[PDB]
Design an enzyme around this catalytic site. Sequence first.
Site, PDB file in Angstrom:
ATOM      1  N   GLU A  45       9.365  -5.582   1.588  1.00  0.00           N
ATOM      2  CA  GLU A  45       8.803  -5.364   2.926  1.00  0.00           C
ATOM      3  C   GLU A  45       9.751  -5.881   4.005  1.00  0.00           C
ATOM      4  O   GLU A  45       9.527  -6.959   4.569  1.00  0.00           O
ATOM      5  CB  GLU A  45       7.433  -5.999   3.080  1.00  0.00           C
ATOM      6  CG  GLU A  45       6.366  -5.188   2.408  1.00  0.00           C
ATOM      7  CD  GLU A  45       4.967  -5.660   2.634  1.00  0.00           C
ATOM      8  OE1 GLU A  45       4.727  -6.719   3.285  1.00  0.00           O
ATOM      9  OE2 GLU A  45       4.026  -4.991   2.187  1.00  0.00           O
TER      10      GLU A  45
ATOM     11  N   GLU B 296       2.835  -1.112  -3.203  1.00  0.00           N
ATOM     12  CA  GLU B 296       1.938  -2.214  -2.973  1.00  0.00           C
ATOM     13  C   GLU B 296       0.804  -1.742  -2.046  1.00  0.00           C
ATOM     14  O   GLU B 296       1.072  -1.213  -0.963  1.00  0.00           O
ATOM     15  CB  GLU B 296       2.676  -3.387  -2.312  1.00  0.00           C
ATOM     16  CG  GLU B 296       1.876  -4.706  -2.262  1.00  0.00           C
ATOM     17  CD  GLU B 296       2.684  -5.804  -1.693  1.00  0.00           C
ATOM     18  OE1 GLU B 296       3.663  -6.237  -2.249  1.00  0.00           O
ATOM     19  OE2 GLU B 296       2.193  -6.348  -0.599  1.00  0.00           O
TER      20      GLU B 296
END
Length: 300
Positions: free
Chosen positions: A136, A225
Amino acid sequence: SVVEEHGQLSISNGELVNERGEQVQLKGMSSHGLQWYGQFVNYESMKWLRDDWGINVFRAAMYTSSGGYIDDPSVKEKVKEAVEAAIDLDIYVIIDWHILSDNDPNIYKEEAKDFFDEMSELYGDYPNVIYEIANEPNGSDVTWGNQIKPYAEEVIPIIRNNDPNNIIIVGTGTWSQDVHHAADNQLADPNVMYAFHFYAGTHGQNLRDQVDYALDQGAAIFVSEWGTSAATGDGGVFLDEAQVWIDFMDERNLSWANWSLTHKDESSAALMPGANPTGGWTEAELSPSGTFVREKIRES
């Protein structure tokens, strides 16, 4: 059975396909940080997920910072344990270089290169492996064009020297939400996918439309995710919006891994405090989130 049947995965016309060219959809679990909850990552727990939940992929979330790999590299050996369990269980495995507080993937790029060199040399002749090179990226000063894409264009050659064509998942801006910019400025490697992450506590209608925009540019998307909770990993479970996302992913044939396999007292955690780290969970040992996710994978 899964990896024997589907074998070598690749991207064809923006879609994840198997070695005979048929679309395939992966659904599974992510670990939480291997530096905190590594005890849930082992052959027996993964076998229980495969057989009782129906998972066909497992994601090893190796935090880089927050006490992870950069601070203590021993956690790479837990990644190796997970990869070897997936190979023995005949399921796919995602090796996740799990950046977060280290919000620009370039911060630890040298270490990432060395780590992916090692992992691709060890495992690059297995079809099970999927490399996730930057969980991320985040922050307004971390963009696709300036930070993420050039990072990927340093890491991907390292992998490709050892492993010419297993899938590589590349994170996107704004916590792996900004698939629009990636889809307009794609990488050259033909077996790349872009990460898209969501949390069901956020109203998701525009995020779905942005995923569709990216797919319409021929970019392949892996939802590596997602959570049933808010974006913090906590704050309630939002099953109505989670189900909307599930249905959207099925319609778009998007593969996914749910966050996360732990007994931590947060809403996104799949397990209750009791839960045996080697599997065999009763209904009471699954959290509200875990019960839902398990149902989704079993019905698939």
